[PDB]
Amino acid sequence: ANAVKTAEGVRAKIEELKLNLPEGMEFSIPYDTAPFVKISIEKVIHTLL
Amino acid sequence: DVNSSMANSTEGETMAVLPPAIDELGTFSGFSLRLQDRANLGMPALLAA
């Protein structure tokens, strides 16, 4: 499974679930890896250009 | 005729409908929606909704 799509789905689901989150609690996504792959691919695109 | 004749003859809610053209198809049903408790609101509040 591609990592970026799974991370994007998880993030969307958390954002949807926070709309009705009880007061005094907040969601935190401290560790993830999809951003690094997206940065890496963008940099390689820039190098190609 | 079936729908009109038994409008008030019996207490039961009686209604005759033309079967769907395709088994799994509303045929004329535009929209189906589930109004669900997303925040543990409760059954009475859901029914009021």
Residue B39: list chain A partners with CB under 8 A.
Answer: 20
C-alpha to C-alpha distance for B26 and B18, rounded to whole angstroms = 11
**Alpha-carbon torsion A16, B38, B45, B13, what sign?**
positive
C-alpha to C-alpha distance for A48 and B15, rounded to whole angstroms = 68
Q: Which residues contact B14 (CB under 8 A, 6 or more apart)?
A: B3, B6
Decide: residue A38, CB within 10 A, 0-12 exposed, 13-18 middle, 19+ buried: middle
C-alpha to C-alpha distance for B47 and B49, rounded to whole angstroms = 5
Residue type, A19: L
Method: cryo-EM
What residue in B sits closest to A18 (Cα-Cα)?
Answer: B39
C-alpha to C-alpha distance for B41 and B48, rounded to whole angstroms = 11
Supply the DSSP symbol for B38. S
Q: What is the resolution of this structure in A?
A: 3.8
A20 touches chain B (CB under 8 A): yes
C-alpha to C-alpha distance for A40 and A47, rounded to whole angstroms = 11
